[PDB]
């Protein structure tokens, strides 16, 4: 079993899905989280198995507030104390596959095949979405104040207080 190839194939499938329309409106989701997180989980999040984690996928346009070594802080709403989103390269675990539904455990004969595939796909996104975008920012593609179209995933624990900035893994990032 080749998890590197499998991941690359999932990524192509995910790219097609994002071209077709993927993610809830970022402002609506965050406003609902601020008002009523359980309603937000119900309306906007996926559950995998029977766990207490809630997997979100959002899309929108944000303004770059700060550029860091490991991501960008982005504002999607006005009048907030801190940026709404930290779009970072800190990609670990099953958040991408669980938020997107691109792969599930039942697709694999072994648990280790699922785990290695999730690792390979996180590598693709780290390198070819996030780190790639940070490099093109350094080369003049944008700066603080630029607008960025994004699709991003994040995971909440049921009953955890929402704290901003929400750290989210970007699946799509482009200057607008
Ligand atoms: Cl798109
Ligand atoms: Cl296993």
From TrEMBL:
Residue ranges the record marks as coiled coil: none
Source organism, top-level taxon: Bacteria
First and last residue of the signal peptide: none
Residues with N6,N6-dimethyllysine modification: 4, 13, 43, 46, 68, 75, 81, 104, 123, 126, 135, 139, 158, 163
Protein name: Lipoprotein
Species in which this protein is naturally found: Thermotoga maritima (strain ATCC 43589 / DSM 3109 / JCM 10099 / NBRC 100826 / MSB8)
Residues of the full protein shown: 39 to 214 of 217
